[PDB]
């Protein structure tokens, strides 16, 4: 019986959106994007 079965798809996509929402914040808050300027 699927009584509260929306809760599981509410939960797992939430815990995936959290682990994505710290991966886009981890590149928004990045400092520079210079590809080849490090060893020069």
Partner 1 sequence: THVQGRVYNFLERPTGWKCFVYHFAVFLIVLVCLIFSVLSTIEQYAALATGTLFWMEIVLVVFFGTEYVVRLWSAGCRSKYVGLWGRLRFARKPISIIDLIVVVASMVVLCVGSKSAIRGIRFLQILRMLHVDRQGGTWRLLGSVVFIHRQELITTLYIGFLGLIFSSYFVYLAEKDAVNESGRVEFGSYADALWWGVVTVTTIGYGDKVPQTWVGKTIASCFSVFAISFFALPAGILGSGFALKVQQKQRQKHFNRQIPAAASLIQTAWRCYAAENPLREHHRATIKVIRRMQYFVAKKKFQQARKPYDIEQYSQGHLNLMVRIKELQRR
Ligand X SMILES: CCCCC/C=C/C/C=C/C/C=C\C/C=C\CCCC(=O)O[C@H](COC(=O)CCCCCCCCCCCCCCCCC)COP(=O)(O)O[C@@H]1[C@H](O)[C@H](O)[C@@H](OP(=O)(O)O)[C@H](OP(=O)(O)O)[C@H]1O
Closest approach of partner 1 to the CB of residue 3, in Å: 8
- Least spacing, CB of residue 7 vs partner 1, in Å: 9
What is the four-CA torsion angle of 32, 34, 36, 38, rounded to 10 degrees?
A: -30
How is the chain split among helix, strand and coil, in percent rounded to 5?
50, 0, 50
Backbone torsions φ then ψ of 28, nearest 5 degrees: -60, -45
The binding site for partner 1 (CB under 8 A) comprises 2, 5-6, 8-10, 12-13, 15-17, 19-30, 33, 37-38
Residues 1-40 that bind ligand X (CB under 6 A): 33, 35
**Residues at the site binding ligand X, with contacts judged by CB under 6 A:** 33, 35
């Amino acid at each position: 019986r699927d009584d509260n079965s929306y809760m599981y798809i509410l939960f797992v996509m939430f815990l995936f959106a959290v682990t994505v929402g710290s991966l886009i914040l981890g590149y928004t808050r990045s400092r520079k994007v210079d590809k080849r300027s490090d060893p020069y």
